[PDB]
Design a protein around this ligand. Structure first.
Ligand SMILES: CCCCC/C=C/C/C=C\CCCCCCCC(=O)O[C@H](COC(=O)CCCCCCC/C=C/C/C=C/CCCCC)COP(=O)([O-])OCC[N+](C)(C)C
Ligand SMILES: CCCCC/C=C\C/C=C\CCCCCCCC(=O)O[C@H](COC(=O)CCCCCCC/C=C/C/C=C/CCCCC)COP(=O)([O-])OCC[N+](C)(C)C
Ligand SMILES: O=C(O)COc1ccc(Cl)cc1
Lengths: 322, 322
């Protein structure tokens, strides 16, 4: 069946540390009362300005741009376009600030946590044939989709003529370290994998020194933020259910539609579909907190996702084989 | 001059990442204005409360108490006794508070940086045994000397009769994260090296996620604090010389005296002496900044010692080697 009992344990081992960090952050902010809200904001700003950009640079620079499969990229782009279209259509009939929910909808719908909790799960269920397609997904995710998400965040922030707002958002984006990180990362990937240049050991050691606890500190900030809320389900039960349906019932459905449209055939099809039902991630939450765009919804989604990501992933895996 | 030129590159490569993190912190605090003073204090608090204790626990757990060299421990204790007596005597006849000055002196004089700026250097200049000796010294440091320094910090904070103040310092020490970290690390090292109780990966992964970036974060905090002051050499002129002649002319000299007192022989007599003539670690800084005890003096020493680490250590190597 593939469930075994020595793989769903690998999943739990990969997931538990992210929970230990969140619990430590929450206890520190709530019961121990170490960090004031300003200090928590400073920690989150450090995560968003240094850890995340450096991790994105590493991810982009450690993958060959000339080996990425065009079909996978087309499928990912089509999924993102479809989710944008459906969210825009929904926000017209039902619901002021409409762009804010689009960013939130995209954050919790088409940005799975493929980096950490998507690697062991999928690598075990299908082997190494799924441990080289989830890096093509993660690199594309970081570069293209975090650049676009940051542009949308800046545009929304500037909103509160028309070319003035776009110009202001673009000007604030070029100063954003994430853009520089992604651009330098892709340039270095091209150079390394075409001309063979190797990064000097000093620079690699410096980057690995300053951006090694990025995931742990991100979880710490995410746990700090839930110390400032009244309940674990900050948004509410009704909104939490929608947050789950937007991540495990809509994202996977749009990914299946995109894969069918692109006609994915080999394990690419199943890995592409089953990686869209993965946990939500924390980078979207980090951005939401930094720009203060419905952080409660994102962070509430992250927890319950990471809880229920195993049963849903196994259900999708059983469905696919059928 | 006989030292192989590759050693110089090893030292420079081991030292560059720390300077890079320091420069990034300084720029973010002073030139980019990313962090307010409260946010910098929060980052330093996070480093001191979650990164340093976990790193110390790791260091203690990955050492075997039953292979420790008694002569090395006696030499290390005798250095700190000699330094304590000499510092008290000099502060007695000549010269706030004496206890605070004693703490600063014992933080700038008998607490070098061995973990990072000692292994690649003293192991690439002497051999492989030096790595084990430095590991033992670092374990002694993080186990007993950091705890004693924290107790002294708490005593100074309380002072700023005797039994009541000592009791208050003890009460404030038992809850300190470092105390619990070291007291659990020693017990776990005993259990793991006497019974084979390997630490489950679910816990090692959590500890690493929350402690890998501890060193980079400490350097970043040092850079932020240095940005807080006006000039790079904040302490002045007679506090940047009487702070380095106690770390490179007294810290090593009293180790040389203690080595003859204990009669260290072979490589030990040299590794144990040249490890004392190394730059200051950032943990004593972190502590001083947390407790606000003349942090400028420690920061200046840390900044100016990493530059002369190679000249001074080389001079000691070519002097003792005779
Ligand atoms: C068995 C495995 C070990 C598990 C830990 C259990 C230890 C023994 C049991 C209890 C004591 C432990 C208390 C620790 C919590 C901090 C101190 C405290 O106690 O919190 C605080 C003091 O914290 C602090 O400064 C900062 C928090 C430090 C958290 C430490 C996180 C890093 C931990 C590193 C240790 C590494 C351990 C290795 C684990 C792997 C082992 C295999 C005092 O508490 P309070 O009530 O007095 O005031 C608090 C309540 N108010 C605010 C209302 C007065
Ligand atoms: C030989 C040994 C020594 C070599 C050391 C090598 C690397 C050191 C380590 C990391 C890089 C140092 C940080 C660079 C920051 C650039 C400025 C910036 O990221 O944007 C900064 C903003 O930043 C920040 O807020 C965050 C600061 C932290 C930067 C983190 C960057 C992460 C990206 C890393 C990729 C770099 C890889 C190294 C190169 C490898 C390929 C050759 C904008 O200022 P601006 O001038 O770009 O535009 C400003 C325009 N206006 C003047 C109008 C304002
Ligand atoms: O981080 C550094 O470079 C200073 O070296 C040490 C770091 C942590 C401990 Cl517990 C002891 C020494």
């Amino acid at each position: 069946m593939g469930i075994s009992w020595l793989d769903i344990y690998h999943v739990v081992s990969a997931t538990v540390p992210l929970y230990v960090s969140m619990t430590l952050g929450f206890l520190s902010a709530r019961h121990l009362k170490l960090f004031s809200p300003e200090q928590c904001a400073g920690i989150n700003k450090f995560v968003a300005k240094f850890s995340i950009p450096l991790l994105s640079f590493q991810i982009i620079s450690e993958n060959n741009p000339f080996k990425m499969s065009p079909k996978l990229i087309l499928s990912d782009i089509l999924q993102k376009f479809l989710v944008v279209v459906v969210l825009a259509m929904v926000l017209r009939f039902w619901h002021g600030g409409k762009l804010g929910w689009v960013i939130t909808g995209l954050s919790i719908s088409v940005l799975p946590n493929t980096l950490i909790l998507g690697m062991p799960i999928l690598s075990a269920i299908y082997g190494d044939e799924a441990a080289s397609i989830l890096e093509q997904i993660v690199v594309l995710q970081s570069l293209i989709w975090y650049t676009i998400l940051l542009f949308l965040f800046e545009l929304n922030a500037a909103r509160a003529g028309t070319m003035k707002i776009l110009l202001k958002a673009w000007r604030k984006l070029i100063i954003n370290p994430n853009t520089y990180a992604t651009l330098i990362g892709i340039i270095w990937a091209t150079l390394h994998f075409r001309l063979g240049w190797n990064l000097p050991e000093m620079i690699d050691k410096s980057i690995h020194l300053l951006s090694d606890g990025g995931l742990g500190m991100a979880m710490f900030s995410l746990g700090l933020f839930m110390a400032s809320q009244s309940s674990i389900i900050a948004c509410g039960t009704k909104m939490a259910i929608i947050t789950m349906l937007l991540k495990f019932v809509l994202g996977p459905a749009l990914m299946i539609a995109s894969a069918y449209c692109i006609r994915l055939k080999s394990t690419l099809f199943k890995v592409a579909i089953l990686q869209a039902a993965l946990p939500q991630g924390v980078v979207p939450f980090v951005f939401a907190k930094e720009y203060n765009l419905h952080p409660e919804i994102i962070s509430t989604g992250v927890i319950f996702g990471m809880l229920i990501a195993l049963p849903t992933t196994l259900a999708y895996y059983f469905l696919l084989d059928l």
